Structures are given as C-alpha cells and as structure tokens.
Amino acid sequence: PGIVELPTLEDLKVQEVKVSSSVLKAAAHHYGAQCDKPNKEFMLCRWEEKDPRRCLEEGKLVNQCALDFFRQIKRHCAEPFTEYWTCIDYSGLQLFRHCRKQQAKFDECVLDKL
Amino acid sequence: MFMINILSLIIPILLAVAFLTLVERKVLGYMQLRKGPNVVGPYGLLQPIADALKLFTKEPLRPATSSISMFIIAPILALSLALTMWVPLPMPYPLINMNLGVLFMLAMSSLAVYSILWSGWASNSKYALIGALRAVAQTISYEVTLAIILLSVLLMNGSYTLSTLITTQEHIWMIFTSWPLAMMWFISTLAETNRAPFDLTEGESELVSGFNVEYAAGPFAMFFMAEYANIIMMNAFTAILFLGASHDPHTPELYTINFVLKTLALTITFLWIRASYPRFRYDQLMHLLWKSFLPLTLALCMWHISLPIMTASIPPQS
Amino acid sequence: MNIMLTLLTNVTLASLLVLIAFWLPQLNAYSEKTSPYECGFDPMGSARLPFSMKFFLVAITFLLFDLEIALLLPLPWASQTNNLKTMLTMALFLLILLAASLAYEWTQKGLEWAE
Amino acid sequence: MWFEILPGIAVMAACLFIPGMATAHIHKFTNGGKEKRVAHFSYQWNLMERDRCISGVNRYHVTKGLENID
Amino acid sequence: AGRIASFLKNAWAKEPVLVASFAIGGLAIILPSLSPYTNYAIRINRATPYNYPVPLRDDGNMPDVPSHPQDPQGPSLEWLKNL
Amino acid sequence: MPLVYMNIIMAFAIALAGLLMYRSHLMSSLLCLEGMMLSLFIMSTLIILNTHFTLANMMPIILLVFAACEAALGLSLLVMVSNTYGTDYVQNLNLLQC
Amino acid sequence: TMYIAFILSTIFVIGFVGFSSKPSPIYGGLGLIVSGGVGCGIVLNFGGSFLGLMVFLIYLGGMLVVFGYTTAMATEMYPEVWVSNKTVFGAFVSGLMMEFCMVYYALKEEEVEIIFKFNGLGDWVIYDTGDSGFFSEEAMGIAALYSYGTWLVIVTGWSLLIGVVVIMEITRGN
Amino acid sequence: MNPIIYTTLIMTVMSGTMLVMISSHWLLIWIGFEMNLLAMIPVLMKNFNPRATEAATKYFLTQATASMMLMMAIIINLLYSGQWTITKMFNPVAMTMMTMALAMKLGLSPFHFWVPEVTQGISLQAGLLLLTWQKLAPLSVLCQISQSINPNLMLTMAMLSILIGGWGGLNQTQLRKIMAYSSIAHMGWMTAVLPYNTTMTILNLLIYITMTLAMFMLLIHSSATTTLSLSHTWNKMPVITSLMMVTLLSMGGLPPLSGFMPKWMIIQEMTKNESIIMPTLMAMTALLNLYFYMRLAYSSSLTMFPSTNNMKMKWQFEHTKQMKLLPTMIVLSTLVLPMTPALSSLN
Ligand SMILES: CCCCCCCCCCCCCCCCCC(=O)OC[C@H](COP(=O)([O-])OCC[N+](C)(C)C)OC(=O)CCCCCCCCCCCCCCCCC
Ligand SMILES: CCCCCCCCCCCCCCCCCC(=O)OC[C@H](COP(=O)([O-])OCC[N+](C)(C)C)OC(=O)CCCCCCCCCCCCCCCCC
Ligand SMILES: CCCCCCCCCCCCCCCCCC(=O)OC[C@H](COP(=O)([O-])OCC[N+](C)(C)C)OC(=O)CCCCCCCCCCCCCCCCC
Ligand SMILES: CCCCCCCC/C=C/CCCCCCCC(=O)OC[C@H](COP(=O)(O)OCCN)OC(=O)CCCCCCC/C=C/CCCCCCCC
Ligand SMILES: CCCCCCCCCCCCCCCCCC(=O)OC[C@H](COP(=O)(O)OCCN)OC(=O)CCCCCCCCCCCCCCCCC
C-alpha cells in the first residue's frame, strides 16, 4: 500500500546520557523524584499516541532533564555519589542492600546541598 | 577463559572422586576396627591412583551376546551427566547461572537413570537384566517423592534459582524451617544415588555385581566415577538447599570453605550409613516411599503452600 | 552456547576415556572369555526372554502421578498472584485429588505386587 | 588411629575448593575486578547492552559516569 | 466419642505416619481461613509494581490522584514498612 | 512460516505414518502414538511463545496430561492383551471380523 | 543466525524417523528420548525454559516405564535394530531421504509444499523486537493456571483420578 | 466391576460428552473427547473376555488416532488465525484434518471397520451405549463447524457409508454386526444432510437413537445375539417378536412409520438445494438395509422356526428385570409420523 514516514537522522539527534546502569541505579530515586514531570508527560504521550514518531520532543525534554539533574549532582555531591555508585557497581545483581553506608552519605549530601 | 573454567570444574571433581574412594575405604575400615589402605602411599594416598592406572591398563572385553553400541554408550552417558550436574551449583558463583537451576537437576538425574538400564540390557545377561529392573522400580519411587519434596522446599524459597537459595538462607537454615522434608530428602537422595541401604541395582549379595557384571577395565571405572560424582553432587545440593552458608561478596572464599565442609560432612554421613545398616528389599523400598513418604510428603506440600499465605511471608519472585 | 560447550566437553572427555580404555591395553579375546556370565555354568535360557514385572500397576500409577507433579511444579510463581484465595483453593484441590487417588489404589490393593 | 583418615579428607577438600575459587577468580578477571553481571530478565540484559554501547570499547563492565557526561 | 477415641488411639499405635499426614493436611486446609494475615499477603502481592504506572491525563476533577509521587494523595505502604 | 514449523509438522506426519503402519508389536505403535503428542506439544509451544499469547502457555501442560492418560490406557490394554495371548502381537487381535 | 533451531529441528525429525521405523521398543524409546531432548532444546531457544525442561522430564519418566514393559511384554529372542531388518532399514532410509530432500529444497528456494507454504529465511528474522521486564512471560502465563483456569484444573484433576480408577479396573481380570 | 465405579464411569462418559457440547474452546472440546474415551474403555471391558479386550484395544487405537488428528487440526487452525473459538475454520488443510478425525470418530466410511468389530466384541448394553452416545458427541461438533465443511468430502463419505452399511448388513448373520452396519448407514444419511440443514441432522439423530434404543432393548429383553437365537423367541414371548418386527419395518424406512420421516425430510431439504442425483442414489441404496431387516423379520416373527425341549421350563418362568422406557421407545420409533412439523420446535 503506502509509504511509511520516518523521521530524518537530523531530528533524531540529541545529547545522550552516557552514564552506566550502576550510575543510573544509584541516582534513581532522586531522579524519579526530581525529573518526574517531563518523564510523566513523555510516558502519557507514548501511551496515548502509540507511536514513537509522535513523541520525539518529549524524549528530547526527558534527556534534557536527565542531563540537568546529573550536572546538578556533579556540581555539589560528586564524591559521595562516586563512592555510592562504585559500591553499587560491584554487585552482580546491583543490590541496594549492600551499600547502605554510601547511600546514607549521598542522601545526606543531597539533602543539605540541594 | 570459559574453557579454563570448565576444566577447573571438571578435573578437581574427578580428583575428589578418587580420594572419596580412598576416604570411604578408610572410614569403613576404622568403623570395622580395621585400618584401610595405608601401605600404597603415605596413609594410602596413592591408592586411588594405583587403582585408576590398573583399571585403565587392564583389558576391556565386549561379551559375545552384548549389543556393542549401547554397551559403550552407557558409561559415556553416566560420566557425562555426572560431570554436567555440577555446572549450575553456586559455590558461591555458578559456572552456568540458570533461571531454573533445580528443574535442570531433576531432568538430568532422570536422564542419568537410563545409563543403568541400557548397560544392563545391552550386556545381555540375566544378572544385568535383574539389576536394570531393580533400577526401574527404584527410580519410580524415589522420583515421585523427590519431585514433591523439592517443590515444597523451593516453595519456601520463591524460585528455582540456587543463588536465591543462598539469599533465602542468609539468616537461618532451611533445615530449621523444614526438618521433616530434610529427613525425607536425605533418604530419597540415598535411594537416588543407589547407596546403602538402597544399593539394589548393584547388590553383590543377591546379584553378582548387578547391572555392571559384564563390565571390565576402563568402562567399569567410568561407572564407578559417575556414581561417586553423583554422591558428592547430591550432598552438595543438599548442603546448599538446607544448610545455607553465609556469603560475603568481597571475600567469596569463606562461602566456598563452608560449602565444602558441609558437603564433606554429608558425604561422610553417607559412608557412615553404609557401614551401619543392612540392605533393603526393593519391594520394601517401593512400599516405603509410596505408603510412608508419599502421604507425609503430600501433607507437608499442602502445609508449605498454605503457610506463606496464612502468615504473609510469600518470598519475592526475583 | 556455554551450556552446549560444557556438554560437548563432558561428552568428549568421556569418549576419550572409552577410547583409551579400549585401545591402550593388550587384548586377548577368545570364545570362552567373552561368553555370558552365570556363575561358572552355562545359561539355560536366553536373557532376552520375557521377564515378568510384578509392579506393572505401580508403573502406570507412576505415569499419572508424575504428570500430577508436573502440574504442581509452577506453584512458586502462582504464589505471586493477587487471587491468593483462588490459587490456594485450586492447589489444595489438586493435592487432595492426588491423595484420593493414592487412597483409592491403596485400599483397592493396587500397591501390592503380583504373586 | 582414626586421625589417619584426615589426610584423605584434606585432599578431597582441597580438590573441592578449586572449582568455586577458580570460578570466582575467573568471574572477577573477565569482568574488570567486579562480580559477573547477573541477567535473569530482559531488563537486566538491556541494561548490560546499554552499558556495552556507552562504554565505547564494546565491554559492559567498563563503567562510565559524570566525567563522561561532562 | 468413645469410639472416636478408640479409633484414634488404634491408629496412633498402628499408623502414626497416616495420623500425622491427616493432621498436617487438615491444618493446612483450615488454618488459612482463620489467619488474619491472608489479607496482608494479598495486599503485599498487590503492592508489587511489576510494570510501569502509566499516568492519567488530568481533567482537573481528580482530587484523589496525586500530581507528584511525593504528594500525600495515593496509596501508602506505611503499613508494610512496619511489618 | 519458518522452516522450523515445517520440520515439526513433518515430524508429526512421520509419527502418524508410523502409527498407521503396524509391524508386529503393539508397543511400537504406542511409542509412535507418544511421538505424535510430543510433536503436538512442540508445535503448540512454538506457536504460543512466538505470539506472546500469555494465557495460552498452560495449554501444552494440559496436552501433556492427557497424553499421559492415553499412554496409561494403552499400556493397561497392552498388559491385558499380553496376559491373554502371550505376546503383544497385533496378529492375535483377529477374533472379531468385519 | 547460526541455524541452531533448524539443525535441532532436523535432529528432531531424525529421531522421529527412527522410532517410527520401529526397530524394537528399546530403540524406539531411545529415539523418542533423543527427540524429547532435542525438542527441549528447540523450545529453550524459542524462549520456554520451563516448557522445555518439563516436556523433557515427563518423557524421561514415561520412557522409563516403557523400558520395563518392553522387557516384560514386548521382547523377543533377537530384538530388531535398524540395520537388522530389511523393512526397518527401508523405512528409516525412506524417512531420512524425504527429510533431506525437503531440507535441501527449502534451503535452495522458498518451498511451497502441497499442504503449506514455507519461506526459507531466519528463525531469528521471525522473532519480536520487544522485551518484558523483571518477570518471565512464560512463567506468569503458566502460573495463571491457578488464578485463571479454575475450570481447567477441575477437569484435569477429575480426569487424572478417573484415570487411576480406569487403569485399576482394566487390569482387574476375572 | 463395582456398581459405584460403574455408575461413576458412566457419569464420566456423559460428562465428557457434555463438556464437548457446552464448551466454546477447542482445547476444552478436545479434553471432553479425551475424558469420554478414557472412561469409555472400561465400560467396553466390563465383562472380561478376550473378545472384549480385543474390542477395547481396537476402539482405543482408533479413537486415539482420531483425537491426535483432531488436535493437529486445532493447532494448525490456531497457527493461521490465532483463534481458539470453535467457529468456521480458517485453514482448508485444518478443516480437512478435522473432517477426517470426526469421521473416524463417527465411523463414516472408509473409517468403518472398527464399528462392526467392536460392536460384535462388546455386550448388548455396551453396544447400545457405544452407538447412541458416541455418535451423539462428534455430530454436535460437526454441526457447530458445518459452515466450513467441504461438501464434496462430506457427501463422498456419506455415500460411502450408505453403500458400505447396506452391503455389510446384507452379508451379516449376527445381530450386533447387523446393528453396527445399520448404524454406519444411518450416520451416512445424517452427514449427507449435514452441510445443508443441521436441523435435519438433529432430527435424524433423534429418530435413529429412538429406534436403536428400542431395538437394542428388545434384544436385551429376549437375550438374543444371533439369528437362530432370536428364532426361538416366538415360543417364549410372541409379543416381543411382533414389536421387533414393527420396529424393523420402521428402521427400513417404510411409510407411515417413524423411520420414513428423516429420509423424507432429508430428501426434501437436499432437493431444495438442487441436489437430485444424490438423494435418488441414497433412497435407492436404502433398499439393501430394508432387505436385511426383512430377512431378520422373516426368521423371528413372520415364520415359526423349530424350538427345543427346555423352552417348556422357560415358559414356566417369568422375566424379572423391567426395561426402562421400552414401551415409550417402541411407540416413538413407530407412530410419530403425524407429528412431523415439530422439527421446527427442534430448530
Ligand atoms: C558447540 C557445541 C556443539 C554441540 C552441542 C550439542 C548439544 C546437544 C544437546 C542439544 C540440546 C541442548 C542445547 C540446546 C541449545 C542451547 C539452549 C540454551 O540456550 O540454553 C540456555 C538455557 C539457560 O537457562 P535458563 O533456563 O536459566 O534461561 C533463562 C535465563 N536466561 C535467558 C538469562 C539465560 O540453558 C538451560 O536452560 C539448560 C538446559 C539444558 C538442556 C539439555 C537437554 C539435552 C540434554 C542432552 C544430554 C546428552 C548427554 C550426552 C549423551 C552422550 C551419549 C553418547
Ligand atoms: C527434631 C530435631 C530437629 C533438628 C533440626 C536441626 C538439625 C540440624 C542438623 C545440622 C547438621 C550440620 C552438618 C554440617 C555441619 C557444619 C558445621 C559448621 O560449619 O558449623 C558452623 C556454622 C557456621 O557457618 P554458617 O555461616 O553456615 O552458619 C550460619 C549460616 N547462616 C547464618 C547463613 C544461616 O554454623 C554455626 O556455627 C551455627 C549453626 C546454626 C545457624 C542457625 C542460626 C542459629 C540457630 C540456633 C537455634 C537452634 C535450635 C535447635 C537446636 C537443637 C536441635 C536438636
Ligand atoms: C587414570 C585415567 C586415565 C588413564 C590413562 C592411561 C594410564 C596409564 C599410563 C601409562 C601406560 C604405560 C603403557 C602401558 C601399555 C599397556 C601395556 C601392554 O599392553 O603391555 C603388553 C604389550 C606387549 O607387547 P608384545 O609385542 O611384547 O606382545 C605380543 C603379544 N603377546 C603378549 C601375545 C606376546 O606391550 C606393548 O605392546 C607395548 C606397547 C607400547 C607401550 C607404550 C605406549 C603407551 C605410552 C603411554 C604414555 C602416556 C600417554 C598415552 C596413553 C594414554 C593417556 C593419555
Ligand atoms: C475427593 C474424593 C472424592 C472423589 C469421588 C470420585 C468418584 C469416586 C471414585 C473414588 C475416588 C475417591 C476414592 C477415595 C476413597 C476410596 C478409598 C476408601 O474407600 O477408603 C478411604 C480411606 C479409609 O480407610 P478404610 O476404608 O477404612 O481402609 C482401611 C482398612 N483398615 O481413607 C480415606 O478416607 C481417604 C479419602 C481421601 C483422602 C483425602 C480426603 C479429602 C478431604 C478434603 C476435602 C476435599 C474437598 C475437595 C475440595 C478441596 C478444597 C480445598
Ligand atoms: C421427566 C422424566 C420422564 C421419564 C420418566 C420415566 C420413569 C419410569 C421409567 C420406567 C418405565 C416406565 C414405567 C413403567 C412401570 C414401572 C413400574 C411401576 O409400577 O411403576 C409405577 C409408576 C407410578 O408412577 P410414579 O413413579 O408414582 O410417578 C412419578 C412420581 N414422582 O408408573 C409410571 O410411572 C408409569 C408412567 C411413566 C411415565 C410415562 C412414560 C414417559 C412419558 C414421557 C412423556 C414425553 C414423551 C416423550 C418421551 C421421550 C423419552 C423420555
């Protein structure tokens, strides 16, 4: 029948979030609390439009919020965060149970600085 | 590097099997007021090596009436499955991490049954046939009871993953939780490994060496190695399942030492039982499981289904 | 992949052991050595004649109970459902029917070997 | 006496130490000194694939962080 | 009652395995209907977030739906926290 | 359709042609009957797993259960026939004629 | 690609050819066990680990009974093997030749049988891109036998109990 | 067999058939067939003898093969549609497999040999249950899936059934084999009308069941299993022979008896669809069935065969057990032709 429409490679371009899964899992609860609104908007768009091509701008905003959140962490609590996600990265299952001290230090740092 | 890991899993197991033969001979000797091997090497340490060399330099014969293809395949199947059973065991890290590590064990054991049947049938002798059919009955009874007991105990766990078993037993022991199932499991493992009082497939007193009567030299040694590897593997599985050692992710050698000590304790208990008790009759073995273990096993399965629900202690799925 | 490599390694090691066993030693074969074993005398019949099985009914019951346990195996995942009451009822129903089968056979003498 | 059984048990224990310790050492060697990643589910597998993609060396265990985002 | 006691004493002297089996099975059938923690188990199973909680489109007439995860509105797991 | 489905259907056809062509033993035909249900199990689970029909995953288990019931029934009939005639040969089931 | 599923399917067909050529119930059971293990492998590749291991375990248990029964009921002086008989070898060779012909035709061109149309391409091609998360869809669907499928449990349990009654009644004699 | 076990097995057979009839899922239909077969085997083997064992073995083999083919058809249909509901089948190959399996279950030619063999093997009560109920279930499935039935395959098997039933019945001299071949012919008639009017299929099913119940219960009452055994019944109870003769006339399709109604309605319905050669051939071939019914009627009622000397003691004694609904079956199988337009109620 018809020809499918695909976005060009120019408007699929965005600043990638090049942290690892351990880094993301360490700053996951704070990220979910801070960047909730763009992510909820993107998820509502994705579930209503049922089309990746119709929610690209919301994805751009999601990436922008993630980058802003990580820059804000990097400016204030880089050392406790590095210790925390270094502890998380050791575990094969990436367990929160084994890194409660480093998590406590990171939570104290982000509660005072931010 | 994975091939190096496979070799590091295989070769130490075979060495442990040889020295388990030595240890069993000496333990039985001291329980029978003898000494056991102490001449061949220092405290008889070279005895397994001497026996292995003798068996593999002796002549193997194929009986004139035997079916040669399944006469050869049976020891190959036995030893291959004996070596394969070790790959999902966490010590504390499995060589192969399976989502369903327990069903793999059950399936491979049920397959390893057929080595006895095919070696007995392919030998084409009456004593071999009698041993094979004794194996058939034994597998019937122990298989049904083993499956139900494993279902219950793993129902206390949450999944069929042995690393999850370690995490479950982080605080106390499954043997403290479920000691009746532990007793029935130990008896079923004896019946499964064909150990006394259930050594009926190869019963020297009734049958002249049972199913492997016609086997000589190397092919006999393969059956011996497979049986002893199965003994150690089943004791290791029992230790992981009921005697959970503490795990420290940064120093995993502590779990390995604890696991090895518990496995050795269970294996020496197997040898102790063999020294202590008479032999069953295989009809009485069938009547023991079905008429005694199976009712209690079903009742305990119902109890262990209901207990997490009635107390709000259902384990996590992952 | 890794499991296939492991199976290949185990099979190859066992086959090499068989090959060494059958090719290293000196062999001397004659009709008397390779004759079937029956305690020093010749076998009267053949080992391929029919061999009566006194537990033929327990074997069929084993087939049925084996598939009962196949039904019971997915219970650990069934405990994560929201319909806990329905799950518990059906699990106990299956176990009670298994117990009923065992009781019926036991009382009707299905567990007794043929004479 | 009964303590002459111990050297055989010692050898058997030493043999049973090798598999677990060897597996632990090889897991740490081929995963950058860390535990081998357990991927029992598609989510964990996708995390591993993303870690491989972002590393730039086609190895998931090479972990990148804030120094890489900026 | 006397017949029941005689039967039970005979069974306990002849088939203790069967007596124990029936006692365990009967307790397993009966106890869940009397336990107050069955509802707690159901609630714990319902509280596990296996999949993503897709948000709702706000019509301006949803006072019981939180606008943020940390808002007071929405289900609370404080009961499970101290359990 | 992939070639895997072709091979599974071919295996079913082979097992069906095996059942319909008796030789002497009733046991061999029973084994052919058990192969047909194995191929049915494999085909059903391949179709269901590919399509992510989640609630249909329990169907192959029920299929196996009734395969077991059929195998039990056939073995019972085989032991009765062997008791009557001394062998499981199908040539002895000739008392009744069309 | 690696054609692992295709190779396993071919071995599956080979085992079926064996036990359907019907040498003798011992080797019929051997071929059926091989086919069961290979089918376990096929469905493991396609995704169902529980289903594969379960069918393998069920057939391992079932063939154990068949061995004991063929020792007692279905044995003769010289059990037949594939090369022992002209009919058995003929049927085995016919099945192998048919499988080879169809495999070759499918690999060389998109083979449309007189029954169904088959395309020679990737079993990896036919797969789905999407993924689940933190649970197994197969495990959850099978576990739904108790929450959903109350009717199925009832009819299955009734059938099993009546099966025990039936096997006891058939073998009564008298 | 214990009476409790026997009645629970009968109830299990009926439950399997009812599950087949009430299910909307192909898996549940297959489960019903399996449950029916499993509980039906011991009923055949109720009176243990080598003939009963052989009949049960043949029945099991045939029904297991048919169930396997049926499940293959179900799975093939699921492959091409993803539908488990029993409706029009979406694949012609799956439909052909389903038709073959259901025909093998019903005994339509060329899948008919097991019918006379098993019926001769089993007792009169078991044969009654077999014919009646085991025809009752697969025909309901066929009626559900009728709109996708291949007319050529269905009508070919139907005409084959009519011809084979007539010829086999011509040769037979045993009462149970006569009943089996008559059953094959009647199944032929029903499945011939099936692709045009399932209502007429149901009407023929009901009339056939009534006539078969009356006939089998008369045989059970008279304790006759051969022609010569039935030739002694005029000297013990001449009423039973007369009722049997009227029932045989009804089964042969003679007006104004109740056996004429299904043939009449089916001929009319097929003629509405511009079928003439098929109804004419079907009507002419039924003369074979009428011939061997009349041959049976000559021996038992219209002529007096020699008797024996112990018939005097039999005269002195009286029949104890009372057949349930035998007078009602006799009347319904012979005198309900003026009530033909109730097939609309049947609709
Ligand atoms: C390079 C090797 C070439 C030779 C290979 C020979 C293979 C022979 C057996 C084929 C079937 C088994 C392998 C199938 C393909 C791989 C499947 C797979 O990916 O599994 C991953 C799965 C992973 O486990 P999982 O269940 O945890 O998977 C879910 C979790 N993820 C997805 C994250 C992995 O492995 C298993 O489940 C293990 C099952 C093994 C089943 C084996 C059955 C056949 C046994 C035959 C024994 C023969 C003994 C020797 C006889 C000799 C006689 C002379
Ligand atoms: C009717 C009687 C029922 C009895 C049920 C219990 C049977 C116990 C059988 C034990 C067999 C042990 C064989 C292997 C021996 C290994 C030895 C070893 O390494 O030990 C060091 C090991 C230490 O290594 P570990 O790390 O494995 O031990 C702790 C393991 N965690 C915490 C992970 C569960 O054990 C100990 O030192 C402590 C053992 C008990 C641990 C459980 C918690 C304490 C429970 C106290 C209450 C007990 C009440 C019952 C007591 C009386 C029972 C009759
Ligand atoms: C522990 C498990 C694995 C075991 C692996 C093997 C263990 C043993 C290793 C040492 C073996 C030493 C050689 C013994 C050979 C048999 C002796 C014999 O038959 O003598 C009578 C025969 C006598 O021959 P003859 O010609 O005098 O006799 C003619 C025949 N009669 C008797 C009738 C007169 O000896 C030989 O034929 C000698 C053959 C060469 C011997 C050396 C070759 C083998 C070298 C082995 C090195 C190790 C690697 C390769 C082996 C496999 C292991 C990887
Ligand atoms: C669930 C069973 C009912 C199913 C009925 C199906 C039709 C009948 C076919 C038989 C199947 C069931 C047969 C089981 C009883 C037959 C055996 C028997 O007669 O005796 C039972 C025997 C009695 O011993 P004696 O007869 O005295 O012999 C010893 C002599 N010294 O022991 C029993 O009573 C066991 C009976 C079954 C055990 C399980 C009891 C079930 C009770 C739980 C309630 C079940 C409700 C089901 C819903 C479950 C919801 C959670
Ligand atoms: C809803 C169920 C319908 C069928 C039930 C049949 C039950 C009886 C079966 C045995 C054969 C018929 C009876 C022959 C006499 C038996 C011995 C005797 O003396 O019986 C006395 C009995 C007295 O009647 P009684 O039992 O009191 O009535 C029911 C009370 N609740 O005498 C009688 O009962 C005699 C009269 C019986 C009823 C007439 C026969 C059936 C009528 C059906 C009407 C519809 C027509 C189509 C029928 C299709 C097939 C069912």
UniProtKB/TrEMBL annotation, chain A:
Its main location: mitochondrion. Keywords: Disulfide bond, Electron transport, Mitochondrion, Repeat, Respiratory chain, Transport. Residues 77-110 form the CHCH domain. GO terms for biological process: mitochondrial electron transport, NADH to ubiquinone. It is found in: Mitochondrion intermembrane space. Complex I is composed of 45 different subunits. This is NADH dehydrogenase [ubiquinone] 1 alpha subcomplex subunit 8. It comes from Sus scrofa (Pig). The lineage of its organism: Eukaryota, Metazoa, Chordata, Craniata, Vertebrata.
UniProtKB/TrEMBL annotation, chain D:
This is NADH dehydrogenase [ubiquinone] 1 alpha subcomplex subunit 1. Belongs to the complex I NDUFA1 subunit family. PANTHER family: NADH DEHYDROGENASE [UBIQUINONE] 1 ALPHA SUBCOMPLEX SUBUNIT 1, NADH-UBIQUINONE OXIDOREDUCTASE MWFE SUBUNIT. Keywords: Electron transport, Membrane, Mitochondrion, Mitochondrion inner membrane, Respiratory chain, Transmembrane, Transmembrane helix, Transport. Accessory subunit of the mitochondrial membrane respiratory chain NADH dehydrogenase (Complex I), that is believed not to be involved in catalysis. Complex I functions in the transfer of electrons from NADH to the respiratory chain. The immediate electron acceptor for the enzyme is believed to be ubiquinone. One of its GO terms (cellular component) is mitochondrial inner membrane. It is found in: Mitochondrion inner membrane. The gene is NDUFA1. It holds the Pfam family MWFE. Complex I is composed of 45 different subunits. The lineage of its organism: Eukaryota, Metazoa, Chordata, Craniata, Vertebrata. It is a single-pass membrane protein. It comes from Sus scrofa (Pig). Its main location: mitochondrion.
From TrEMBL, chain E:
This is NADH dehydrogenase [ubiquinone] 1 alpha subcomplex subunit 3. It comes from Sus scrofa. It is found in: Mitochondrion inner membrane. Residues 55-83 are annotated as: Disordered. Accessory subunit of the mitochondrial membrane respiratory chain NADH dehydrogenase (Complex I), that is believed not to be involved in catalysis. Complex I functions in the transfer of electrons from NADH to the respiratory chain. The immediate electron acceptor for the enzyme is believed to be ubiquinone. Complex I is composed of 45 different subunits. Signal peptide: none annotated. Belongs to the complex I NDUFA3 subunit family. The chain holds residues 87 to 169 of 169 of the full protein.
